[PDB]
């Protein structure tokens, strides 16, 4: 996708991934597992419950369409009725399914970009000290127990 | 050591489109459209529906004696038709602009019967009826026919006091015969006046036998018009004048819809009504009827409005 991360260079998701969208998983000595980054995750779920949420204010007001009775000599101004009718629905339903459309598609590049600006951060902030696998983990140059994991998560890694 | 960074992945089987894509596989999403309804005609946030099974719109408006159930007037959020009302005008006739009377009418919310013209005010036999209206006739009118081989001249007057406006109704008789004319009016050569501030009609009659209708030859064009506060309605004829006796007083503004089904009424209460049924929502949009009313959400013809709110699910496996 346009951020290149998800379905990108990191191939796949993880079903052991249960608490957020985004996370980091480490190994090490002690072992192997997952945890969800909470600042990303907050951040994101905040922007599209917010989208949600004005969609859903701009979209639901409705328009009125009184099936009014027509006389035989009325023929003209029953297909004028209809013109409008069928318009004012066409448009709608156009305006509709294309906001859904093409929201649906930033909303899915959003993530993401997400996920490709957590592992920039992380990067970043491991300089030298690590290495790519291109798979979207960093090989340390150093032994990384779960404490020095732990600041790598949340920013304070030291030697960056 | 390492330390990766990655993404969730779900059981989910939900899908969404994109303009460049369709059926992609997301972890979350929510539907839009909302496609459910109770199946039924309920009350909405403006009352119960106005429900005639017996008679049309204008069987009410003109009394016509099998809809008796009504003179005590109502009030409602809309109006509803079933196919079973057939109810309307008895006597073979027909109602100047019909559709303008029955939209009037259902644009209001209520109606209330107010006495335009006292029988006896009246110098001539005022209580006809007719085996075509149930050996009886219409609530709404008089139809006035000559007393003592005599039929003066008749001239009576009403002004508008009630302070709101007056649908008041009337018709001209189209005998088949000149001896049925004479025989009700004493007269073939007749003039009928009926005029306000603002309109003046005359009608005279034109006798001759029309096709049969509820076995009948003969004919009453119906017709109708709004006595506006402090107007004076006033009525002149020698002849042929089926007078006002009773108008209606309409207020307030109903959805006002005139559905014609048969649908299942029941003792609910909705934000939305359609002619399919009713339903409640906070979901943005519906497929059940474009001519839904009430409070309601947008309408829109299609069968589903999934919005993606995860992200695209991608299986490790
Ligand atoms: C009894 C008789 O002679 N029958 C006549 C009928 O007579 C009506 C006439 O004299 C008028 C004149 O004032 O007065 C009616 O009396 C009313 C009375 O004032 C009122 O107090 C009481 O409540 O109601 C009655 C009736 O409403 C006399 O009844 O006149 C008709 C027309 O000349 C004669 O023709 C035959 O009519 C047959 C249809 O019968 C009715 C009907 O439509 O049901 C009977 C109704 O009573 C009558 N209504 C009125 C107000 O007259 C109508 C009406 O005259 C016609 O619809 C007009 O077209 O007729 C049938 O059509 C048959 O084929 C005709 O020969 C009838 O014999
Ligand atoms: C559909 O909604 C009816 C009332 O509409 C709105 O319902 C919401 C509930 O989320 C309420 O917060 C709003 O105040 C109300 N809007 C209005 C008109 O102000 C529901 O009607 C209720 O029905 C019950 C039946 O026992 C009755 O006791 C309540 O008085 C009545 N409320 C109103 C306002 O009439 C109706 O139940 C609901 N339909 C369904 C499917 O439950
Ligand atoms: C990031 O994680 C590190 C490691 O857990 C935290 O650093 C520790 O902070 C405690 C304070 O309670 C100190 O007593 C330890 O000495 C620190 N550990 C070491 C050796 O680094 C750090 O506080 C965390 N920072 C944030 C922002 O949460
Ligand atoms: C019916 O007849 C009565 C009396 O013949 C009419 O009443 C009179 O009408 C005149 C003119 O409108 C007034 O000046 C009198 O004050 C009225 N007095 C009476 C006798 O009531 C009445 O208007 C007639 N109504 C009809 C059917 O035209
Ligand atoms: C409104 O939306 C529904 C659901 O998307 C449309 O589809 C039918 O929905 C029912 C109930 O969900 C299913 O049992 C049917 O199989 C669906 N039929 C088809 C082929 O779509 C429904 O048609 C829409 N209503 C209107 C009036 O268009
Ligand atoms: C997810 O689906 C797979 C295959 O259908 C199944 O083995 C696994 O148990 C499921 N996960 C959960 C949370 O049940």
Avoid at chain 2, 200 to 207: A, G, L
Wanted: charged residues 20%; neutral net charge.
């Amino acid at each position: 996708g346009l951020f290149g991360a998800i379905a990108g260079f990191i191939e796949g998701g993880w079903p052991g991934l249960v608490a957020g969208w985004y996370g980091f998983q480490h190994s090490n000595d002690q072992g192997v597992g997952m945890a969800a980054d909470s600042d990303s995750t907050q951040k994101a779920i905040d922007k599209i419950t917010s989208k949600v949420n004005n969609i859903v204010d701009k979209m639901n007001k409705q328009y009125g369409i009184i099936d009014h009775e027509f006389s035989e000599i009325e023929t003209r101004l029953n297909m004028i009725n209809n013109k409008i009718d069928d318009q004012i629905q066409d448009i709608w339903t156009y305006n509709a399914e294309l906001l859904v459309l093409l929201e649906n598609q930033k909303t899915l590049d959003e993530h993401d970009a997400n996920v490709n600006n957590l592992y920039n951060k992380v990067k970043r902030a491991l300089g030298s000290n690590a290495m790519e696998d291109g798979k979207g983990c960093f090989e340390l140059y150093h032994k990384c127990d779960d404490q020095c994991m732990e600041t790598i998560r949340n920013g304070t890694y030291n030697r960056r | 050591d390492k330390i990766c960074i990655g993404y969730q992945s779900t059981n989910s089987t939900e899908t969404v489109d994109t303009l460049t894509e369709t059926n992609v596989p997301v972890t979350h999403a929510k539907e839009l459209l909302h496609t459910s309804h109770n199946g039924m005609l309920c009350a909405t946030n403006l009352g119960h529906p106005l429900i005639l099974d017996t008679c049309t719109i204008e069987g009410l408006i003109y009394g016509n004696p099998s809809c008796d159930l009504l003179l005590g007037g109502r009030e409602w959020s809309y109006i509803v038709e079933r196919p079973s009302a057939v109810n309307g005008m008895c006597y073979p006739g027909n109602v100047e602009n019909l559709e303008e009377l029955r939209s009037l009418f259902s644009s209001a919310s209520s109606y209330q019967r107010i006495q335009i013209f006292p029988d006896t005010i009246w110098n001539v036999s005022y209580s006809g009826t007719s085996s075509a209206c149930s050996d009886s006739f219409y609530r709404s009118m008089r139809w006035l026919t000559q007393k003592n081989n005599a039929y003066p001249i008749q001239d009576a007057q009403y002004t508008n006091n009630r302070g709101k406006s007056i649908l008041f109704m009337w018709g001209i008789n189209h005998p088949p015969t000149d001896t049925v004319q004479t025989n009700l009016y004493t007269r073939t050569d007749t003039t009928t006046s009926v005029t306000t501030e603002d309109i003046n009609r005359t009608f005279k009659p034109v006798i001759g036998p029309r096709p049969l209708v509820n076995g009948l030859h003969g004919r009453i064009d119906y017709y109708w018009s709004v006595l506006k506060p402090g107007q004076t309605l006033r009525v002149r004829s020698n002849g042929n004048l089926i007078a006002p006796w009773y108008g209606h007083i309409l207020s307030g503004e109903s959805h006002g819809r005139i559905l014609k089904t048969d649908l299942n009424s029941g003792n609910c209460v909705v934000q939305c009504q359609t002619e399919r049924g009713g339903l409640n929502t906070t979901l943005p949009f519906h497929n059940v009827s474009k001519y839904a009313f009430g409070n309601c959400p947008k309408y829109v013809g299609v069968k589903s409005l999934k919005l993606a709110v995860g992200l695209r699910n991608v299986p490790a496996r």
